[PDB]
Symmetry: D2
Subunit: 202 residues, 4 copies
Amino acid sequence: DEAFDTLLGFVELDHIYSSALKEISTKLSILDDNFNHIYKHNPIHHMERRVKEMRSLIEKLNRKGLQISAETAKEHILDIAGIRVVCNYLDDIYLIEEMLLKQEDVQLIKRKDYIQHPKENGYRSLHIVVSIPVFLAERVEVLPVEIQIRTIGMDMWASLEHKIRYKNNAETEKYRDLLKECATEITEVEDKLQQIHSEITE
Amino acid sequence: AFDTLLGFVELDHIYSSALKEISTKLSILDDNFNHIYKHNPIHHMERRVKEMRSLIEKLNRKGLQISAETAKEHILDIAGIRVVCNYLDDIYLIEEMLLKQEDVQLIKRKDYIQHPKENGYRSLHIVVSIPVFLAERVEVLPVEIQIRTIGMDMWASLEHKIRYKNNAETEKYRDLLKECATEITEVEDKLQQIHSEITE
Amino acid sequence: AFDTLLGFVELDHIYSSALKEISTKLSILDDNFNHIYKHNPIHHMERRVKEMRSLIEKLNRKGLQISAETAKEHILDIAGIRVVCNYLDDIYLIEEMLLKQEDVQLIKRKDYIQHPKENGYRSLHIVVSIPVFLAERVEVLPVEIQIRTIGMDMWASLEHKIRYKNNAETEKYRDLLKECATEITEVEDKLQQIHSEITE
Amino acid sequence: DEAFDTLLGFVELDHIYSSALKEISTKLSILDDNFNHIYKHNPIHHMERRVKEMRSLIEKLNRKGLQISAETAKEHILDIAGIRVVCNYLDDIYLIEEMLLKQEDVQLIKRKDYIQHPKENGYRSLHIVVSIPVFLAERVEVLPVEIQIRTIGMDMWASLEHKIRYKNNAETEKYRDLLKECATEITEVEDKLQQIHSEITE
Ligand SMILES: Nc1nc2c(ncn2[C@@H]2O[C@H](COP(=O)(O)OP(=O)(O)OP(=O)(O)O)[C@@H](O)[C@H]2O)c(=O)[nH]1
Ligand SMILES: Nc1nc2c(ncn2[C@@H]2O[C@H](COP(=O)(O)OP(=O)(O)OP(=O)(O)O)[C@@H](O)[C@H]2O)c(=O)[nH]1
Ligand SMILES: Nc1nc2c(ncn2[C@@H]2O[C@H](COP(=O)(O)OP(=O)(O)OP(=O)(O)O)[C@@H](O)[C@H]2O)c(=O)[nH]1
Ligand SMILES: Nc1nc2c(ncn2[C@@H]2O[C@H](COP(=O)(O)OP(=O)(O)OP(=O)(O)O)[C@@H](O)[C@H]2O)c(=O)[nH]1
Ligand SMILES: Nc1ncnc2c1ncn2[C@@H]1O[C@H](COP(=O)(O)CP(=O)(O)OP(=O)(O)O)[C@@H](O)C1O
Ligand SMILES: Nc1ncnc2c1ncn2[C@@H]1O[C@H](COP(=O)(O)CP(=O)(O)OP(=O)(O)O)[C@@H](O)C1O
Ligand SMILES: Nc1ncnc2c1ncn2[C@@H]1O[C@H](COP(=O)(O)CP(=O)(O)OP(=O)(O)O)[C@@H](O)[C@@H]1O
Ligand SMILES: Nc1ncnc2c1ncn2[C@@H]1O[C@H](COP(=O)(O)CP(=O)(O)OP(=O)(O)O)[C@@H](O)[C@@H]1O
Ligand SMILES: [Fe+3]
Ligand SMILES: [Fe+3]
Ligand SMILES: [Mg+2]
Ligand SMILES: [Mg+2]
Ligand SMILES: [Mg+2]
Ligand SMILES: [Mg+2]
């Protein structure tokens, strides 16, 4: 087992995917600011970025039966770069998607809509993987970025469900029912807030 | 020599420094609670120094002289910080942790969580003083801290947007906003109860 | 309806966005050069959008109409970024790396390093355009990039502070500032020569 | 060798010394901004913070003959938290020191002045270790912070000398003489800039 260059391979990945996050963050910040400038509403509440830790990446590769290599990771793992866009209201989610995908150097790679089709546990979010060019010192990389788009309420719910799920399944089955209740109650109140906000901005 | 009250520019400078002092304290508390218990009580923070426009209006509203000296004496929210927390009990955790510090003095406390306003507003308001070390002197300045949950914050942002138009028009939503505040309260109570159980 | 030229507020908004686009590009280049060669060519960066006050004066100075449309057409430094580099050759490294990018177009180049101004000023100035993706349209906007070493920057900050008083008074230092520029040049040449040797 | 708790000890150190850096950074930012507000000069050009990496800390402990433990590190290693304050002009260095040490919760612990007494290789900087209180969730720590105060020119010189020194002594002896020349030439030009700046701000 002499392969130390596999480790260098993953260190490169961390560096270039971190740069992809900066490119998309800047795009999103500009969209939010311009929309606010025109319509006096910020669709984005806040954003969170993370590059997948190498340990988490190797486990995912193993989980999926894939080789433990950077070439394989770059080809088959689409969430090495992840950004979470937390929006103020439900309709902001799809506004953000539309504004970003219109851009000529952003290509849609994968789309999963858990808002129209929530997961069994009650999870909601719009997930889009997009590619963006990253201009490095001596080459260009076109890299995927996984964007999770959700409301404040979806994010509150997901953070709590995550914390339960990441402490064994015994506990994740007491709260299953009550967590579903919460997801639905969050859905209902955000619908009302959205309804009010739409009327006062006609 | 007319009312060249430059003093208000001085106010903005030193109250902005007080905000940096308190923000640093809060960030350290959040980081350390996370280090020990694996939970961040703070979701995010927002700071603002009261604009001179709003400040003069408040002084007039209260029948006070239009001067920086009078503002520093009578207006406790020139420096404001908003601490948005993840769960209801984080609000009181943050308060307890800040007031334990030896260079933090409590000046005023209003808890609109235990006693919500008529329209449904909820938040814990504490005014504290902190020392600010300047180039040639020390100032002990008040800072208004609004501590609230994410849910309370969403509600307040929406209600604020209503009130800040022709304020007469669009008071039909009073009833429906109150419903939302109650519904947010109930869901956050349930989230809090779950979070308490899985963390002992 | 008098000259409610709100247009200048529009200008500030979109040229500020262009600055974010270029800054992100430069930061990524610096990070990657460091990753490969273990050197950061960038020491730090400073951004500013030209104030409306200065902008109208420039339009008047050039005999141009006082309008945002005219400003966007004729003023190439509404958005300015200053890239302060660690060594002299970093200046040209940064230029080469930026101009290689396919969505960056060169508009104008003035090299006051190869041809210093009379007072001793030195810097590389390149105006480039970049696309800015807004909510409902694309804008291709010029950005003035001043690229200089740390030594050039120290000199310029001091000279700027002189010129920006009663500008008639304090022109005795012209001679002594020129000496400093030459002395800074000579030391930075020597630092550069050492740095080149220990990095092959 | 079961001591895994030694590693936890050092992880605590990183966390609390990082907090000490935030406290001192905020103090310094406020001083610079207030001085600028009054006198229209920013004495600070920029600041750089770093918490010593655990590897570097263990090597220093070994170099000094000290036990490999967090208690020992906290007692005997004064640069776990380091901040570098780069100033615009020479006199700014001592202004910053004076303004900071006047504060009632800052105590001077150690002072080494390589400006009045430069090192043989030509290194210049004012080094002060100070203590500051850090208010944590359940306790207070009074922690040292090593502050390196220097001009822009001293910093340019030190960065280059560092890069030479950290590639074997063979090369660090060709440039010794020329590096001394540079340090002196930087000293002389900054004296002139300082002299001009003093006259135009009388
Ligand atoms: N808190 C929470 N997060 C979830 C849940 N499902 C997904 N996520 C998050 O959203 C990410 C992407 O989810 P998916 O869109 O379903 O991923 P995928 O389609 O299976 O493709 P791969 O993730 O690469 O395997 C996950 O990695 C999680 O971070 C859930 O039930 N609760
Ligand atoms: N969005 C929103 N904010 C509120 C409401 N009440 C208070 N606030 C905020 O909390 C701040 C302080 O309010 P209070 O503590 O009750 O005191 P006050 O009536 O505003 O005047 P003072 O006590 O002198 O400071 C206000 O200035 C607002 O920023 C509300 O119903 N909706
Ligand atoms: N501190 C300082 N800055 C300078 C000096 N010359 C230029 N600059 C800066 O560089 C900017 C651009 O200068 P130039 O490229 O030569 O062109 P210009 O004469 O200023 O007018 P335009 O070309 O139309 O943009 C100036 O606006 C200044 O910010 C100088 O002698 N001292
Ligand atoms: N670039 C450069 N840095 C130096 C030189 N000397 C010190 N430093 C830096 O400044 C730091 C502190 O230096 P000193 O004040 O001399 O430290 P000390 O008195 O020996 O006490 P300890 O460092 O704990 O052992 C060093 O750890 C270096 O980071 C030098 O000749 N060149
Ligand atoms: N697209 C994204 N944007 C921002 N943050 C994200 C994100 N995806 C994940 N995260 C966050 O990053 C942290 C670590 O998550 P990961 O280790 O990468 C496992 P995961 O990605 O969520 O599931 P997975 O590996 O099976 O795909 C989690 O706290 C988390 O929710
Ligand atoms: N007081 C300080 N403030 C800011 N940066 C610092 C600093 N001291 C050191 N550094 C920087 O931190 C990086 C790592 O330095 P360290 O690993 O901690 C060894 P050192 O501290 O410089 O010598 P030493 O360990 O013998 O005391 C170096 O690039 C560096 O110059
Ligand atoms: N304590 C605080 N922390 C953070 N942000 C605050 C804050 N107080 C107010 N703000 C914010 O500042 C904006 C307007 O503030 P102000 O001009 O000072 C009127 P106000 O402070 O809210 O009421 P008041 O003048 O009666 O006291 C609001 O959008 C807002 O909620
Ligand atoms: N390209 C640039 N990048 C970063 N900062 C800049 C910059 N150009 C100017 N500045 C800074 O902005 C300040 C004043 O700028 P301006 O109001 O626009 C006058 P100017 O741009 O320097 O000359 P000009 O109007 O003839 O073109 C100066 O302190 C300063 O050097
Ligand atoms: Fe403090
Ligand atoms: Fe871009
Ligand atoms: Mg994932
Ligand atoms: Mg108020
Ligand atoms: Mg200009
Ligand atoms: Mg050291």
